[PDB]
Amino acid sequence: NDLVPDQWKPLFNNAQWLVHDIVVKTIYGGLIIAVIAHVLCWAWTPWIR
Amino acid sequence: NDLVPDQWKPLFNNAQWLVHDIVVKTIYGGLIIAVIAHVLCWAWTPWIR
Amino acid sequence: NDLVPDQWKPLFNNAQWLVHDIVVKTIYGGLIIAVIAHVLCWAWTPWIR
Amino acid sequence: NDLVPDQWKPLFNNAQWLVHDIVVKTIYGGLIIAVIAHVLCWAWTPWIR
Amino acid sequence: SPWPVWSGYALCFVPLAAVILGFIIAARFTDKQATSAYLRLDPAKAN
Amino acid sequence: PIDLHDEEYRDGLEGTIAKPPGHVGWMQRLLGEGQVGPIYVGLWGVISFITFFASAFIILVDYGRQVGWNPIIYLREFWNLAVYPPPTEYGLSWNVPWDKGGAWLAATFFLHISVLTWWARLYTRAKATGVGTQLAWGFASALSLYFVIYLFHPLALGNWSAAPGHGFRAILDWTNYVSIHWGNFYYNPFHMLSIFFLLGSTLLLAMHGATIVATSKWKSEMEFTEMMAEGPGTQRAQLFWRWVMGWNANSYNIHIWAWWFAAFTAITGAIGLFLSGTLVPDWYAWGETAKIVAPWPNPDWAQYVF
Amino acid sequence: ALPLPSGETLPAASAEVIPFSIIEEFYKRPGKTLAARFFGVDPFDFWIGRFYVGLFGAISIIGIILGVAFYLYEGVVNEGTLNILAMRIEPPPVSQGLNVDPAQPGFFWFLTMVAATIAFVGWLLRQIDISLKLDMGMEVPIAFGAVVSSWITLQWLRPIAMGAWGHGFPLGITHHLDWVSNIGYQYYNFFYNPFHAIGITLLFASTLFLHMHGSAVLSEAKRNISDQNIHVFWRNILGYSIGEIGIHRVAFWTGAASVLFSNLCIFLSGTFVKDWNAFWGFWDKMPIWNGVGQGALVA
Amino acid sequence: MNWIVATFMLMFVLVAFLPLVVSLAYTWVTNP
Amino acid sequence: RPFEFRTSVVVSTLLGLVMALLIHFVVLSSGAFNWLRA
Amino acid sequence: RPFEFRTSVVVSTLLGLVMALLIHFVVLSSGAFNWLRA
Amino acid sequence: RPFEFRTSVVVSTLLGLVMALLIHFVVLSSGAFNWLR
Amino acid sequence: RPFEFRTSVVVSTLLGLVMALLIHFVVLSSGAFNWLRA
Amino acid sequence: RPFEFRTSVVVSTLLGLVMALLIHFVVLSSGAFNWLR
Amino acid sequence: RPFEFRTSVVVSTLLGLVMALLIHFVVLSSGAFNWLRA
Amino acid sequence: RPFEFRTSVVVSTLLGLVMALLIHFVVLSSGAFNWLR
Amino acid sequence: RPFEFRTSVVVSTLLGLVMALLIHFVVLSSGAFNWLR
Amino acid sequence: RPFEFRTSVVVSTLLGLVMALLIHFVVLSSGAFNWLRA
Amino acid sequence: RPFEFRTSVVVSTLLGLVMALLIHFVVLSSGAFNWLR
Amino acid sequence: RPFEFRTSVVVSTLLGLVMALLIHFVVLSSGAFNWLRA
Amino acid sequence: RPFEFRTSVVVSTLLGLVMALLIHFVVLSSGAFNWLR
Amino acid sequence: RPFEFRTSVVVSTLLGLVMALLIHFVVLSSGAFNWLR
Amino acid sequence: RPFEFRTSVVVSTLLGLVMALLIHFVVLSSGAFNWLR
């Protein structure tokens, strides 16, 4: 747990920190794409009315 | 439980405090978002009348 | 743990790095082919209208 | 793994390199024959139109 | 219309292939675990 | 850390009753054990007892009222008496006459409470005895089917009439009526999967029982000991099933196989029953559109006439 | 570390780590099959791979191959459907009777049904032989014989008793269900058949017993317990524990009994009974209550 | 209906019931 | 002493709850009070 | 002591949740309040 | 302590998810909002 | 720590995939978007 | 590490194959492209 | 001795009770005595 | 003694209660007394 | 003594409650008193 | 030797008997010879 | 000797019995002999 | 030796007999030769 | 070696025989050759 | 290594055979090529 | 002795009771004697 920060040392491991970073970046990209897709779909056909 | 406050030491662990704090912030954000969503839905179409 | 980079030593084995590289290259090629196929299909017949 | 290349020594045996070569040559021949068959079939009757 | 509907596709042919592959895989791994080497009583001494 | 003598011989609430065990004799001769033994009562089971018998009392009193309080006619028509849910009008309302579905709702509510408390009893006793809690999740998988039949399906359809009528003959009628209403469950894919798993479960039970009984001369029925080291009986069973069909298992995998057969049976049945009415109003028409229905132009119908 | 049969790796009884090869070699002991007693020698008394081939193994394999060939031929040829979920393999018409003619349609149904019967009986006899080579009991043959008798009732006894031979089931995937539905609704309320109800009860009890036994055995596999925890658990809930040897006996008996009662009800429904609603007309006329009611409560 | 053939087939079915009964009787006779 | 305080409390609470629920259900189904529906 | 705090908390919470669900369903299905299109 | 953090977290998450799905499906099936036609 | 990383990852991935499939099915079945031939 | 390489490869390959077959069959059955008559 | 006193008593009492109930029910259903409103 | 006092008391009480219930129900259902409408 | 106080109390309480509920139900169903409409 | 004499005898005799029975049955079922009123 | 005399006798006798029963059944089932009328 | 002689002989004999039976049955049922009453 | 000669021979022979039977049956079923009446 | 050579060979060969059979069957069933009548 | 006295008595009594009940019920149902109206 050398690379883990001081705050999250009791919770995280040196190996799990990297995978957590990967997952966080993936979710960030997915959220960006989801927002873009929702905006395009609303521009195409509104669903609330 | 070094980081745990004095009052809540017998009930919480050091690692559990951080997870509890994360859950508390998540619940507070969800509650704010839900209040906003309910206000917009009422402004759109009342369900009681 | 000799052909793996320093960052990914705790996560990767010296024999699985080669397989990972092969998989990454295959996924990249498949993505490029899929993008080209989608562009051609859209130019042929739009599916949204 | 005397006959195996240095890059692929950790992944391949000495008796598996030959079988891999046979499989690769068979797949290449299959790809060439499939390409020819697809070209003749398209020349006979298009399937997209 | 020589083809089935999409709901037919899913509801019929996804579970069927899933069941076939799952049965074959489970049988293979059950046999692997069964035929492995572990503690046993010697048949020559055991009667 | 667990004293079995205490867990079997305590007193009062959180204890046991019927403490002096009985003996039947013929069960000892035919099944190998005949101890009636004590039974636990721990506040998860008193609630089940009270609620189940409240429901039974309601149903039996309604049965009595339906025959004019005539005991002889009560014995006459016991097996064709039922307490049906409210009619199709006033779909999910509770303001119903007692003789027009009022008693059905109360009995069903108490039965739900009883089954949930029984699951709690099973879970708590499994925890308190030191064993795992697989039986609780199996019962959960059957309660899933039960709750789909009695609660979740009448909901999302809009009426209470989509549920059985609490009778010996009423469940058979419910099965027939539900089959006729929604086309034919012979063309329901989840009915097919449930039947596959059910018949597989029966087949596996028969095979396992016969296999263990055949090799019982070498003490093959002591599953707990064989999981530590194999014996001659287990070896003979493995060899037999390897030479018959070419593959076999050990004395630990077969139980996983059986558990998952039963669980899949319950889950697939629940899913099929729920999907039957809300999304596919006619199963035969769906099967025709899916190309899983055989053509049948020129029947020979003389088989089906008297 | 000693590997346990469950999968545990427990650091260190008379047990030891023995490969399966030694056990497989030790227990061969050729020369004790049923055919050896009759003819003095088994023509096929060897193993081909993991399987043991005997006199009846050859008969079973011949029947299997021939039946599969005939089934595919009736369904790919003479029907021209090319898919297996729309095939419809019918017996001869009821008008034809109990006789078979190659020219008339329905002959390959005869061929497939005969080949399947031969294969099933051969499999039963092979199971008997393998049981007899290992000095085991004959329990699995009893259960499988119950199943095979269920087959023979549906495909041989009922058509012969009814005498027209068009009364056997088509061998088609999703199409034998049509036969089941039509037969069940011809004798309306097949629920009200007593033996069908007993069979359904036994089937449901078998499934419940299998789930209970699997849960009970799996709940103690990898724990430090004294082997008597399961008995206390089963006496605290329901107030009775059957024991180790009773559960398998109950399983075998329930499994056999369900199929036995089912074949009984199908045969009885075929010939001796016509309507299962009229079967219960005797109940309300018994002279203990036939005079106690009025209006809708009469009878 | 020919009632002789039907009764014969019924007798065969009741014969098919027999092996389970024999197993039950064997289990009872042993384990005294 | 014949009974424990736990058993008495549990039995009394369960009996009261069941009786209240049953009485409320019967009164609602009778429809003799003009309550919760015309 | 008679009862543990754990058991009391569990029973109280479960009873409250069940009663809330039942009361909501009974009141809304009565068709006497005009909620979500009558 | 009477209850562990893990059990409370699990029960709260399951209850919240079930309630969200139930309320969404009830509102959609009521047909009183003009949502998704 | 109350929960391991593997449990969180597995639950999150399963929930996300199931929700995505369900939402696509519910949106595309409504026939209110004119996608892929109406 | 939390997950091993073989599990990731197996899950990814299975998901890809299933989605590809399902998408081709849905598109073919929709009859909105003029593909294969 | 071939039988115990307890079994004889039990069998005799059960047979007597069942026979008495059966005879009373048959006579009531016969409608041949003008008893309990014909 | 062939029987205990407990068994005799139990059997007698159950038989008496069942018989009383049966007789009251028969008399009420016969409708020959003008009791309870 | 043949019977203990606990068993007698339990049996008496159950019998009394069952009889009272049965009598109220029969009286309500008879419709001869003008009670609850 | 690969096969024993008695095994060959058993196999040959059984195959011949089965084939003879099959051929008589098929010829009779064909109904092309006027045998036993056929 | 390749075959014991006892085994040959038993096999021949059983084969003869089965053949006699089968031939009687087939001849009596035929249309020429209607089960001896 | 990859295979034993007896296994080869047995497999060949079974395959040949099955093929002959299948071919005779197919040709007889096709009715394209006028053999055994057309 | 990964695969034995015997396994390869068995698999190849079974595949070839099954393929030959399937192709003959399909060609016969199609009815595009005027073969065997 | 994660996967042995034999497993890869088996998986690839089976997948290729299954896909080839499925594609041939689909193309024949489409009736869009004028092949086999 | 091949059979016990107890089994003989049990079988005989059961057979006698069953026969008597059957004969009375059959004679009653025949309607041949004018017994009980």
Ligand code: BCL
């Ligand atoms: C609309 C008018 C309706 C009606 C509709 C309802 C409905 C609907 C409900 C009640 C409920 C109740 N009704 Mg009212 N009720 C009516 C008439 C009556 C009459 C009467 C005329 O005699 C009576 C005596 C009652 C009596 C009662 C009580 C039993 C109860 C409210 C008090 C209570 O228990 O608080 C004690 C309650 C609590 C301590 C709960 C506290 C819960 C906390 C605040 C959390 C709530 C959940 C929330 C989602 C949490 C979010 C955060 C997450 C946890 C992270 N009602 C009429 C017919 N009534 C409610 C109830 O609780 O029933 C069991 C209920 O649901």
Ligand code: BCL
């Ligand atoms: C109905 C109107 C629109 C439309 C509206 C939208 C909108 C709006 C959105 C999408 C989104 C998506 N759409 Mg859509 N969509 C349309 C038509 C389509 C069609 C089609 C054939 O017509 C397709 C194929 C898709 C496909 C997709 C996906 C690319 C995407 C959701 C991915 C997902 O599952 O994330 C969830 C997946 C996961 C949680 C799993 C991730 C797993 C990763 C990738 C791999 C892990 C491997 C590793 C080993 C795992 C470890 C753990 C294991 C347990 C061991 N759309 C129509 C035309 N679509 C969404 C999007 O953009 O998302 C970014 C979105 O918000």
Ligand code: BCL
């Ligand atoms: C009304 C005319 C009816 C008829 C109506 C009845 C009825 C009704 C009954 C009989 C019964 C009998 N009938 Mg008559 N019977 C008819 C015609 C016949 C004919 C005939 C050829 O015609 C014959 C042979 C018989 C023969 C018989 C006997 C089998 C039997 C009476 C003897 C007996 O067992 O005493 C031995 C009987 C006893 C020892 C009983 C002792 C019971 C004790 C005294 C307790 C009584 C209850 C008391 C309240 C207990 C209180 C204390 C508490 C327990 C603490 N009946 C006609 C058709 N018959 C009775 C019987 O017992 O059937 C089994 C019976 O109930």
Ligand code: BCL
């Ligand atoms: C109205 C006229 C009706 C009729 C209505 C009834 C009814 C109704 C009943 C009887 C009962 C009986 N009937 Mg009458 N009966 C009729 C005609 C007959 C004829 C006939 C040939 O015509 C006969 C032979 C009988 C014979 C009999 C007996 C078997 C019995 C009464 C004696 C008994 O058992 O005492 C012994 C009885 C006791 C010792 C009872 C003691 C009860 C104790 C005191 C408890 C009482 C309850 C009290 C509330 C307890 C309170 C405290 C709590 C316990 C804490 N009836 C006609 C048709 N009969 C009663 C019976 O018990 O049948 C089994 C009965 O219920």
Ligand code: BCL
């Ligand atoms: C039909 C005309 C009248 C009518 C006529 C009568 C008459 C007449 C009487 C009653 C009586 C009663 N009526 Mg009314 N009644 C009517 C309408 C009603 C309505 C209603 C909703 O309309 C209700 C709720 C009631 C309610 C009641 C009860 C208060 C009472 C019966 C109590 C009981 O069960 O005792 C039986 C109960 C028990 C045996 C259990 C006691 C339990 C104790 C109290 C608690 C502790 C238990 C202990 C801990 C257990 C220990 C052992 C355990 C095993 C551990 N009536 C109408 C209006 N009603 C009776 C009465 O006055 O009773 C006093 C009565 O005689």
Ligand code: BCL
């Ligand atoms: C009537 C015309 C029919 C037809 C009817 C048949 C029939 C009928 C049969 C064949 C068989 C065969 N057919 Mg042709 N066949 C037709 C058209 C064709 C066409 C074609 C392109 O049109 C082809 C390629 C074939 C090809 C073939 C071969 C696969 C095979 C013959 C050679 C063989 O196996 O030798 C090798 C054969 C042997 C080595 C056999 C040796 C047998 C030994 C000598 C024993 C003989 C039996 C004797 C009773 C034993 C007594 C023992 C006692 C102890 C004394 N047929 C047409 C449609 N064909 C035969 C076959 O074997 O099928 C499997 C067969 O039965």
Ligand code: BCL
């Ligand atoms: C009539 C024209 C039909 C057609 C009818 C058939 C039929 C019918 C068959 C084939 C078969 C095949 N077809 Mg073609 N086929 C057509 C069009 C095609 C097209 C195309 C794109 O148009 C292609 C690519 C093919 C390709 C193929 C091959 C896959 C295969 C032949 C080679 C092979 O694998 O040999 C490998 C096979 C061998 C090496 C076998 C060797 C067997 C030895 C010689 C023994 C034979 C039996 C022996 C005599 C028995 C007795 C032994 C005793 C000891 C005496 N066909 C058209 C539609 N095709 C044949 C095949 O074998 O498929 C698997 C086959 O049966």
Ligand code: BCL
């Ligand atoms: C007629 C026009 C049809 C069509 C008909 C077919 C058919 C039919 C098939 C394919 C197959 C394929 N098609 Mg195409 N296909 C069409 C349009 C397309 C389109 C498109 C976007 O339009 C695409 C992307 C593809 C793509 C593809 C690939 C997925 C695949 C060939 C690749 C491969 O694995 O080669 C590599 C191929 C090999 C390595 C095979 C090697 C086989 C070896 C040589 C053995 C052959 C048998 C021989 C008898 C053996 C004898 C010796 C014994 C074994 C000892 N097709 C149209 C709609 N296509 C083929 C395929 O392989 O599917 C899996 C296939 O069967």
Ligand code: BCL
């Ligand atoms: C009315 C004329 C009817 C008819 C009506 C009946 C009726 C009704 C009955 C018989 C019975 C019998 N009939 Mg007749 N029967 C007819 C014509 C015939 C013909 C004929 C060829 O015509 C024959 C051969 C018979 C022959 C027979 C016998 C098999 C049998 C009587 C003897 C016996 O076995 O006693 C053996 C039996 C005993 C010795 C039993 C003794 C029982 C003792 C006496 C106790 C009885 C109960 C008593 C209440 C106990 C009290 C004390 C308490 C226990 C403490 N019947 C015609 C058609 N028959 C009776 C019988 O029992 O059949 C089995 C019977 O019930």
Ligand SMILES: CC(C)=CCC/C(C)=C/C=C/C(C)=C/C=C/C(C)=C/C=C/C=C(C)/C=C/C=C(C)/C=C/C1=C(C)C(=O)CCC1(C)C
């Ligand atoms: C239709 C009608 C009429 C209905 C009747 C109306 C009724 C009866 C309504 C009842 C409503 C109720 C009872 C609603 C309840 C809502 C709840 C409990 C929500 C819980 C949210 C829980 C939340 C957000 C929990 C989040 C948990 C998180 C973020 C966990 C995070 C984590 C934890 C803790 C870890 O370990 C490690 C991983 C990670 C860090 C991600």
Ligand SMILES: [Fe+3]
């Ligand atoms: Fe077991």
